[PDB]
Amino acid sequence: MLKAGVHFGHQTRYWNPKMKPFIFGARNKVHIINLEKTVPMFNEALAELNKIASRKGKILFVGTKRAASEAVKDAALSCDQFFVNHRWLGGMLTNWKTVRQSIKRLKDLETQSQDGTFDKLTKKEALMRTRELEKLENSLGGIKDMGGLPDALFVIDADHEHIAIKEANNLGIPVFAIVDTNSDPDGVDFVIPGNDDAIRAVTLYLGAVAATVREGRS
Amino acid sequence: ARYLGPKLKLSRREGTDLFLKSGVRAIDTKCKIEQAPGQHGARKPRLSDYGVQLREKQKVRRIYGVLERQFRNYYKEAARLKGNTGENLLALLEGRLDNVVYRMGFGATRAEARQLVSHKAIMVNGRVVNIASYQVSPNDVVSIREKAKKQSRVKAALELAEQREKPTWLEVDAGKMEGTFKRKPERSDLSADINEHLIVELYSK
């Protein structure tokens, strides 16, 4: 489960004192996460996360910053699971009700789009409707086939995606976050002290998570 | 010093049968119960919190035929006695002599029992007691005197004693027309629907 890796921590600026148990913290004004603390934390997250993944649950990867996209689309979509990669709408969990009818409009407009009446009656309004499918497709992308509110939540940055953590704490959903030294372990049930903005680190990181999700009872 | 008015009106403001006209017939049938306690009685009250507490106290007094200074003194005595003040208050109301004469079937109502008690027709322990609020101790024998024995009332009253539920804390026996108050009634032995915490809280404000 342990591989020598490349991130070793980051974020000189705006570091958070609640990350003080997780910091080794030496070099050149920047903070180094104690990865000897990360490895048991991340193995625990794989443990409980595989435990809910084997109970046939829905996981909802969250990847708004770049380049977490399309790495969260690649990792969630490598499993049979769900994702948010563009702007996470304020309240797609806590009013999922209204977001249910927006997802319903995305389904009705893609069914109307590639099969039904798309060339019908107008060119301009048809262009309008297609770019409504671009907007509703990139905002409600992964979540469009969920049909429930999910059994866990896996966010890739705790301070950048504080809204989703705040809602999953509001609803009693287990939050699995890779925090950095600027972030805050709010209500993150399974904190992982890592590096949020390195693409090597998040592809290794989501590689491991997507690896352990796609083992159910099989 | 006692009510002396329309009785079924009092039973109709409370919404519940207060057993104020037990008498000959069955369940009311000529009361228009629930419908109109006065002219605007068809209106639902939308009653307050003071209104529910007050109205509970009035339910209990209008059952047992007690006025306010006497009831209030029962609350003070039930408060100072050891235990549960609601249950002590019902134990003080159930030891009243007119009540025990009603429970034994000697009177059809509690007012008729109160007139039997009042008109020197009732002895306790072989001594005539003239007083409606005499507090009957446990293991007492309360009976009817030789005068006003075999008068019609009490006979008819025992006739309607069998229609009711035969209280557990008595020895009702109607052959000799004498009874034995054996023990204090448990709270679970009486009526089940009066909320005495409301009258504890009414007097404790």
């Binding site: 148990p21 910091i23 030496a26 490895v39 193995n43 287990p174 049930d189 | -």
Partner: protein, 39 residues
């Protein structure tokens, strides 16, 4: 029982690889969330 892991000497070696003095020893109170019920 402790989970299988790299040897303590190996951890020290990792510490040795760490460039510079390279040791962080801040001590703070630690709070652990209660385990979720199986049910």
């Amino acid at each position: 029982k402790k989970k299988t892991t790299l040897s303590e000497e190996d951890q020290a070696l990792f510490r040795q690889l760490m460039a510079g003095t390279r040791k962080i020893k801040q001590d703070t109170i630690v709070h652990r969330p209660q385990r979720k019920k199986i049910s």
